[PDB]
Design an enzyme around this catalytic site. Structure first.
Site, PDB file in Angstrom:
ATOM      1  N   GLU A  11       0.763  -1.161  -0.024  1.00 35.52           N
ATOM      2  CA  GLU A  11      -0.200   0.137  -0.080  1.00 35.52           C
ATOM      3  C   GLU A  11       0.798   1.180   0.062  1.00 35.52           C
ATOM      4  OE1 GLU A  11      -3.047   0.065  -0.298  1.00 35.52           O
ATOM      5  OE2 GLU A  11      -3.877  -1.921  -0.002  1.00 35.52           O
ATOM      6  N   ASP A  20      -6.479   6.344  -5.061  1.00 34.65           N
ATOM      7  CA  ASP A  20      -6.016   5.015  -5.198  1.00 34.65           C
ATOM      8  C   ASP A  20      -6.156   4.441  -6.616  1.00 34.65           C
ATOM      9  OD1 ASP A  20      -8.589   3.937  -5.451  1.00 34.65           O
ATOM     10  OD2 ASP A  20      -8.691   3.137  -3.843  1.00 34.65           O
ATOM     11  N   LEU A  32      -9.078   3.723   2.791  1.00 39.95           N
ATOM     12  CA  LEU A  32     -10.121   4.471   1.913  1.00 39.95           C
ATOM     13  C   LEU A  32     -10.903   5.426   2.748  1.00 39.95           C
ATOM     14  CD1 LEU A  32     -11.720   4.476  -0.709  1.00 39.95           C
ATOM     15  CD2 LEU A  32     -12.895   2.806   0.139  1.00 39.95           C
TER      16      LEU A  32
END
Ligand SMILES: [Cl-]
Ligand SMILES: [Cl-]
Length: 162
Positions: A11, A20, A32
């Site tokens: 990530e 993203d 998120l």
């Protein structure tokens, strides 16, 4: 290697709101924020999540805290899910980290839908599960991360991450 270092590699870490791979507003370690197109709805969720007025920017410690919560929630979602739990229970420690990674990336609901792969994993048919996991939008959209996760499932070692 462990789940935290594994996800930190997949990530990355960004301290300012970013979009993203899907175009959604995220911050920190793949946290998120919202699926909405609005940067303002993003900043709002962000300040709600941190408990302060952030103006779209957070500190390292704040990012790590969100991350700790997110990993924890991922594990707890697996344990509460009737389809996921039995798979997780059946796996060794390394493979368990691979499932957690999928859950963190795509949510419980999404993973839970990989019916056939889940069954192959439970049965310990590594090679077959790896082949089946590859026939997915997931794999087509984020091929490098998908291959790393898949190798983790096929092998049971951290090789893809070393
Ligand atoms: Cl939150
Ligand atoms: Cl990728």
């Amino acid at each position: 290697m462990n789940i935290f270092e594994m996800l930190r590699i997949d990530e990355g870490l960004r301290l300012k709101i970013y979009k993203d791979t899907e175009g959604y507003y995220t911050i920190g370690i793949g946290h998120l924020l919202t699926k909405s197109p609005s940067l303002n709805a993003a900043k709002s969720e962000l300040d709600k999540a941190i408990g302060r007025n952030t103006n779209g920017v957070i500190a390292k410690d704040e990012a790590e805290k969100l991350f700790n919560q997110d990993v924890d929630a991922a594990v707890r979602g697996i344990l509460r899910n009737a389809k996921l739990k039995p798979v997780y229970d059946s796996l060794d420690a390394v493979r368990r980290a691979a499932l957690i990674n999928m859950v963190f990336q795509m949510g419980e609901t999404g993973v839970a839908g990989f019916t056939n792969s889940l069954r192959m994993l439970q049965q310990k048919r590594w090679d077959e599960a790896a082949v089946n996991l590859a026939k997915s939008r997931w794999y087509n959209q984020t091929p490098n991360r998908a291959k790393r996760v898949i190798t983790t499932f096929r092998t049971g070692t951290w090789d893809a991450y070393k």
